[PDB]
Design a protein around this ligand. Sequence first.
Ligand SMILES: [Zn+2]
Length: 256
Amino acid sequence: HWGYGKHNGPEHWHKDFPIAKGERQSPVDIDTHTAKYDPSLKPLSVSYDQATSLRILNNGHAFNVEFDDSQDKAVLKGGPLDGTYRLIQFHFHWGSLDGQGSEHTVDKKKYAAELHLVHWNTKYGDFGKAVQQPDGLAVLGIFLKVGSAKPGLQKVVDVLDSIKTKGKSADFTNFDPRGLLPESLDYWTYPGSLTTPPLLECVTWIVLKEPISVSSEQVLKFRKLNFNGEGEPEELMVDNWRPAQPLKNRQIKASF
Ligand SMILES: [Zn+2]
């Protein structure tokens, strides 16, 4: 149904998902001069040592690297969060050119891509119940710029040929998401939403200030994926990002 084309893209989503014009939609532009340092924010705790990846899936709008979230293994806590959030999957948004691709922007600057590590609040028991709550998810967003290759990303890049089209999946065990993190965990945080339909307003966004560097060859491989299914007209999976939405009555806080 919805997608990123001219006839079914972000400006059309509100027809099927009225919440698209809601009060706490994502992504947003992060104005670095307006974001206020909050000394009460506790350091972020990213515990991915026991992460258990399972599979990688082309879902028609991105590719998701899925994790076993039936136990407290890979969790995010601390920072602005109260409680424990379990990693369920990560995916990226990217562009057709290096000058665009990220969903959040920083002083209107667009990065080549953006990584979203999606976590759900264990007090709600499962992801489906968590997305119906204002504090149901915590998404760790990390910007990607083109320059040096990210070694930890190569295993993901190399399996993309096996999931070129919509609906294809492939085994993807023993992938360590710690290899996708930048050095610093300094971050900005604000209350927002999922950036793809259903656009539910259930996300505490934690966006890292330090981008990771990936190579041109790495991002070029993302751009070879397809939005379409096998045996259908080829539609390159590029520009799968929603543009910045009105900040409205929200404050972005900085951990630094
Ligand atoms: Zn995303």
